[PDB]
Structures are given as structure tokens and as C-alpha cells.
From TrEMBL, chains A, C:
Organism: Trypanosoma cruzi (strain CL Brener)
GO MF term (any one): identical protein binding
InterPro entries membership: RpiB (IPR004785), RpiB_LacA_LacB (IPR003500), RpiB_LacA_LacB_sf (IPR036569)
Gene3D superfamilies assigned to the protein according to its UniProt record, in alphabetical order: Sugar-phosphate isomerase, RpiB/LacA/LacB
One of the Pfam families matching this protein, by short name: LacAB_rpiB
GO annotation, biological process: carbohydrate metabolic process
Keywords: Isomerase
Protein name: Ribose 5-phosphate isomerase
Presence of keyword Isomerase: yes
Length: 151, 150, 151, 150
């Protein structure tokens, strides 16, 4: 099976149950591992982005799902972890392309920007869409790794 | 207020659009074009890296990056310490990336988002100031600490 | 002041309070007139679209706000009423342009597609943005009226 | 399965794109182009009306309409009895317009939505069938009753 770590900030916690469900809906082979806040209390998105991102980078899980108001902060923070390719997605097309082109391992969504049924579609599309494997994409992904190494 | 612009090959089609949209944001905004000179095939991480390093070094205040979806641009740019690159798809995301995240690079998808919405995104990104709020400052500092820890 | 009638279907009823608030946020001159379901009970979107659309067409109110899952059914149903120009909006740009170009009098939104903070921005933008008045737009709007008259 | 296509002048730029995207949906899908023959200025309601009447008459099964935002297209087309025109901005809206509303016309914004998302919208619209569900049938009939009452 394929483990999928999930994290949110405080307001996106409203939909953490949704996110668990949508991971499961992508197929029986996907196992949600919830790592978000246990409560509605105030938190800082970078702490939860880091947590999920580290799990992905250390390969404890295959994929990450991160949600906050816009998804923007989650995508910035998560990408700061070497080995992470986190994609802010807003529709089916970006969800699919992040996998096909970028072999993205983390999907980020905005709970105050994107309606829940579109978030559902984003998560399912992201999990089900395979990486293309094509020459140019592999080269570009390796160049991103090169950038990490240079810092 | 200098603004470095980069694209890949497909998005090169709108590089003159992006230069124009930066100027439309105000007389003080100065575009510095760093993308491909031709329509020939290039790799997005190279141009992401060029723009991102300029922002990180403090050579320009802002960056603008375009490719098909904007996704690879935002991933590659964020690998540079000091960069906070925001993939925006509308006015709301453009504004909030500045207000919440003090984003210094805006990424757009030329194949996903129409040019008139791209225009709105770039103008909003440049014109909208960072809120300076306590919580945002703290969280931005936490991102910097994630960079440092790696 | 400027009266703004509001209608939803059953699931979008979850945010009817939001919609009332956002109308008020556009300015003190905008008065929300709630005409949606009073309860979470099952309803048919055309009945509520019609209700708000008729109010706009008879000029009892200046503007309408309609919400359902996607906003699509509301825009179809509302446009069936002569005198109504109902715009399905998904962002700030479409909200502004519907006013500038089409002098739209009803804004439709999808509660399951568009996040609430973007719905907020759509409603404020739609109410605050004036119709341009330009020659070509007036001609085109009159042509839409011509289409109504021919049926 | 015939599909009538109309645009205004700016969206005329992608009229060959739309023809191609209709064909990509399947061999059975036949585009019938009814938009402007040149880039010269026209009024969107005229082309909306042409396509919409064809759908209403049962001359074609589906219509595709493009302009800057798609908004005027969806308003004008819906003025024709029997038309259910859906302004779509993504895969989800394209699919749901068919599943819930049995939409017969798809409207897109050439200045708001990128061409690759437009491609996805048109293919999804044509390939996705109406659910036939009881509630949807009833609500669609209620729309027809609103037409009749006017």
C-alpha cells in the first residue's frame, strides 16, 4: 500500500476528516496518515508543513497532502525540505500535471479558496495520476535536486 | 523597485506581456528580463534559479516566473534560501501571497490561466503590501528556520 | 440604498449567513434581502433562482446573489427570466468584467467549487464595480434583450 | 454527434483550437464552425444566438461558445428556450454541467482560462454523460416551465 501523510493549519482543520476520506476514495491502496493539529487551537503552518515534508523526504510515506487558507504558505514551507516537490493545485489540470511533469510528492490546497468538491477531485487526481517518466522531465527534476545540493 | 522575469520556452510567447504588466503596476516598477531570448527548448529550473538567486541576493525586490502550469517554477524557486515563491491563479491568491506570506516571487501558468487574469495577478502582487502582522512575521521566520536546519 | 436579493439551494444554505454578511461588507448602501430556503430541507434550485430573478426583473431589488454547488444551475434558470443578466463568477476578474461588460444584475457562485473567501471577494467586487456605459456594451446588451423579445 | 462552435473577434484566435478539441473528444464528435471568418469586430450575442438556435432546433446536439470571459456568451445563449448553457472554468464544472444540468452548450473565457484547461473543459463536457437521476430530471423540467411562463 501507499502511505499519504496529511497536515493542516488551524482553520483548515475543519476539513481534515474530508481529506482523510478523499485519500481513501482515490483507492484502497492509499492509506491516510493524519499528522495535522488534533484540535482547533492556533498553530503555525510551517510546523505542520515541515512535519509532513520530513516524512516524505525520509520516505516514511510516499505522498503528502497539505491544506491551509490559500495553500500558498504550505507550498513555500514544504519545498524548503530537500527531496520534496510540493505543488499548489487549484483544479484537476494542475493536479494531473504536477504528477505528469514534476513527479510531485506533496499536494497543497487552499480551504478558503477552493471548494471542497474541487479539493476532493484535486486529491484523487494527484494520487491516481502516474509520473510520465519522460526524458525531459527526469532531467528537469534532477536540476531541482542540483539546486538543493548547491545550498 | 526592480522585478526579474523568467519563463521557459512555451511561456516565452507572453514575455512581452509580462514586461508590460510589470510596468502597468506603477512607474516605480522596473522589469528586468532574464528569460529565454528565443522560442527554443530550455529547462524551467535554470530560469527559476536565475531569477530566484537575484531575489535571494537582493539584486531585485521581486521575481515573476511563467511556465505551462507555474508548478515547476514554484518548486524550483523555493529551493533557493530567502525565496518565498507563490503560485497564484487569481486576484485573491496574488493579494494573499503578499499579505500573509510576504511573497517575493509570483509564479503563473501560461497554459492554465488566461492572459487578462495573469495581468491582474502581476499587478495585484506588486501593488499589495505585506501586512506586517505579528503572526505572519513569526511564521515567515519559521520558514527561514526550516532552510537553516537544512 | 441598493437592495440585493439572496437565494440558495439546500446545501448552499450552509453559507446564507456568509452571503448576507458579504453583501453588507460591500458597503452601507447595500441591503441584503434574504429569499433562500429558511431550512436545510431538500429544494429545487430553479424555484429559488426564479424567485430572486423575478424580483430583479420587476425591479423590486437592484441585484441578485445566487448560490448552489457549482452555480451552473442558478445561472441557467435565472437567465430564463426576461430582463435578467446572470453571471457565473469564479474569481475577482469575472466578477468585475460581468459588471463592466455585461452590466450583470445577478451574480451566481458555486459553494462546492469556490472557497468562501473567494465568494466574499466575488460578491464585493460585483456590487462595487460600475457598468462602463461604453457604446459597444450597450449595443450588445440591447441585442440580448432583442433575443428575449424574439421568443 | 454534431457540435456547433461560435466565438467573438478576440476568441477567433483559438477557433482552430476549439475545432481540434472537439475532434479529440472522439471520432463521433463533429465540429460545425459558425463563428467569425475574420478577426474583425463582431457582437457576441449574434454568434451566441446562431449556435443556440441550432441546439434548440435540434440541428446539432451541442454548442461551444468562447469570448473573453465567457459570461456574455452564457447569458445570451440561455435566452433561447431549450438551451442550457454552462460557463465552465475547469474539469469539475465541465463534468457537473453534464451530470447535474444536462447542459447542451459549454461557454469558456479565452482571456480568463488557459488553452490547455479549455481543451480539458471541452473534452470533459462532450465525454461526460447526463446522470439521468430523478431529481435532475425534475429540476431541468422546472427550468423548462420558467421558459413557458415567459
Amino acid at each position: 500500500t501507499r502511505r499519504v501523510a496529511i497536515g493542516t493549519d488551524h482553520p483548515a482543520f475543519a476539513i481534515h476528516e474530508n481529506l482523510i476520506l478523499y485519500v481513501k476514495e482515490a483507492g484502497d491502496e492509499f492509506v491516510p496518515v493524519y499528522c495535522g493539529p488534533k484540535t482547533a487551537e492556533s498553530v503555525d503552518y510551517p510546523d505542520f508543513a515541515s512535519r509532513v515534508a520530513e516524512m516524505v523526504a525520509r520516505k516514511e510515506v510516499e505522498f503528502g497532502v497539505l491544506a491551509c487558507g490559500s495553500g500558498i504558505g504550505m507550498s513555500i514551507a514544504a519545498n524548503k525540505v530537500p527531496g520534496v516537490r510540493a505543488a499548489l493545485c487549484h483544479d484537476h489540470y494542475t493536479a494531473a500535471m504536477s504528477r505528469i511533469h514534476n513527479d510531485a510528492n506533496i499536494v497543497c490546497v487552499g480551504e478558503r479558496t477552493t471548494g471542497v468538491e474541487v479539493i476532493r477531485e484535486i486529491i484523487i487526481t494527484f494520487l491516481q495520476t502516474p509520473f510520465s517518466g519522460e526524458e525531459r522531465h527526469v532531467r528537469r527534476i534532477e536540476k531541482i535536486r542540483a539546486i538543493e545540493a548547491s545550498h
